[PDB]
Amino acid sequence: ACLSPSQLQKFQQDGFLVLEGFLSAEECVAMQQRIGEIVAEMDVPLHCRTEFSTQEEEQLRAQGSTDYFLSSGDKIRFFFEKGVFDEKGNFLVPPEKSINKIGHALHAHDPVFKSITHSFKVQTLARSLGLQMPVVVQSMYIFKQPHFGGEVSPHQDASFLYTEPLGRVLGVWIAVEDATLENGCLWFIPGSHTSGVSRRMVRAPPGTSFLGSEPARDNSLFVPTPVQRGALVLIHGEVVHKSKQNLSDRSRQAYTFHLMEASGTTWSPENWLQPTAELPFPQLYT
């Protein structure tokens, strides 16, 4: 759908905006169903396929893992929960119960997610926001598995998807399932999106690292945004947000993608994600 002038100001004020009912139940279920099929056909990545003996083993595993992620910008790959593994690198429960996320080109290589992503609803919302040349830089599906579904510590999306100038990358988060206080809903600091980023993640000339550091911020400045299935949350590139671990007996599935306004904008050559000749960042508008 489409933004009223009061919704638009509320977004510039807060750095996020909750639009309940953005997608229908059946759109949500389309996503849940295709992600099931993708997970059912998942092959366990080479680096997770082996127990490790030593320090020399855990570092070679850690590197293939880095390689896998870095080259995942134009793929549909699988990223597993940090702590679903034992002392010697083995899965504690089956890998299909242990996925944390899938990324980072669902919007390009899956017909269902491409559909949702380039839908009329999204294209019209983007026009309300006034994006000239929005392109889709990234997408991903977050499972937030029950009981151990990982927390996401406070951050700003621009720390990872940096551009000159700032104010050019926008996050879209769609709730495929109900997001509650219990199961890992998002939290923001409203108004935190107006003094740049404290930290960025950079890629090596193979590897990643951080410039700067995330400051400490009083937990009391975060507000919860629980929402029902189908809600869309808009996320400014610089708003500070987090999610707690899912301590509940049900997941908190979500699909998210990021838009960059390509007009006058420089994508940092140091970002982990770079467009390939196979998939340059595709235009949103069709």
UniProtKB/Swiss-Prot annotation:
Means of activity regulation: Activity is increased by ascorbate. Inhibited by myristoyl-CoA.
GO MF terms held by the record: 2-oxoglutarate-dependent dioxygenase activity; metal ion binding
Tell me the cofactors it needs: Fe cation
Domain of life where this protein originates: Eukaryota
UniProt keywords (A-Z) are:
Dioxygenase, Iron, Metal-binding, Oxidoreductase, Phosphoprotein
Q: Which InterPro entries match?
A: Phytyl_CoA_dOase-like (IPR008775)
Tell me where in this chain the PTM Phosphothreonine is found: T54
The record's section on SUPFAM superfamilies has: Clavaminate synthase-like
Q: Where does Fe cation bind?
A: H155, D157, H241
Q: What is its EC number?
A: 1.14.11.-
Binding annotation for 2-oxoglutarate? K101, M140, H155, Q156, D157, W173, S243, R252
Function statement: 2-oxoglutarate(2OG)-dependent dioxygenase that catalyzes the conversion of 2-oxoglutarate to succinate and CO(2) in an iron-dependent manner. However, does not couple 2OG turnover to the hydroxylation of acyl-coenzyme A derivatives, implying that it is not directly involved in phytanoyl coenzyme-A metabolism. Does not show detectable activity towards fatty acid CoA thioesters.
Q: Which family does it belong to?
A: Belongs to the PhyH family. PHYHD1 subfamily.
UniProt name for this protein: Phytanoyl-CoA dioxygenase domain-containing protein 1
User: Which species is this record about?
Assistant: Homo sapiens (Human)
- Gene from which the chain derives: PHYHD1
